Amino acid sequence: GGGRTNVPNGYSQNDIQLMANAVYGESRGEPYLGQVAVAAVILNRVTSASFPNTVSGVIFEPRAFTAVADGQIYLTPNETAKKAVLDAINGWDPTGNALYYFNPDTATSKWIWTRPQIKKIGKHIFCK
Numbered sequence: 001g002g003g004r005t006n007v008p009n010g011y012s013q014n015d016i017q018l019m020a021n022a023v024y025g026e027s028r029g030e031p032y033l034g035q036v037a038v039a040a041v042i043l044n045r046v047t048s049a050s051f052p053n054t055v056s057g058v059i060f061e062p063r064a065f066t067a068v069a070d071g072q073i074y075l076t077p078n079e080t081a082k083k084a085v086l087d088a089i090n091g092w093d094p095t096g097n098a099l100y101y102f103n104p105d106t107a108t109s110k111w112i113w114t115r116p117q118i119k120k121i122g123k124h125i126f127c128k
Contacts, residue, residue, distance in 0.1 A: 007047050008054060011089060015055040019085045020077035022059050025067025027081070027122075034122040035081060037095045039088035041126070044099055051099070095119070098126035 008015070019042050026038040045051035045058045052058050059065050067073055095101075096118040103123050107113060115127040 006053055011055065016082065016085055016089070017077050018055060018059055018073065020082035021073050021075065022065040022067050023084055024078040024081040025065055025070060025072050027084075027124075028078070030122040030124075032080065032084065033094050034124060035084035036087050036092050037098070037121050037124065037126060038101070039081075039085045040093040040095050041098050041101060042085075043088055044093070044095070044097055048099060094121060095126040096128075098128050100127045101125060102127070 011019075019039060022042060023035055023038045027035045042055070042058055045064075046053060046055060052061060060068060063069075098118055100112060100115070101124040102109070102112050104120075104125050105123075107125075112127060118126045118128065120126070
């Protein structure tokens with residue numbers, strides 16, 4: 001008792017495969033660091049009080065991950081996306097505890113644009 005019981009007790013094989021497919025939908029063709037970056041943001045959302053506390057809850061939150069609306073969820077995961085998920089699970093967060101990201105070329109959200117930018121990796125600026 002008294003442990004970290006508000007977050008998942010590790011991640012299942014389903015959780016990993018789901019997250020890999022989410023990562024791929026966000027970061028195909030990006031530098032590897034940017035793939036780890038999206039995986040880290042997923043985990044940061046899971047562990048944040050501001051978002052759902054299950055992998056499913058985070059991935060399926062409306063508009064959160066393009067792979068859901070695009071219909072690229074129930075399929076065999078990309079190898080390097082999955083490796084990025086495992087790297088993030090093992091504690092690599094290149095984003096400085098980011099919860100959000102955007103593409104500066106396209107983003108229209110005042111709120112997102114007004115958060116301190118942590119950093120840019122590839123096409124994504126990361127924020128919290």
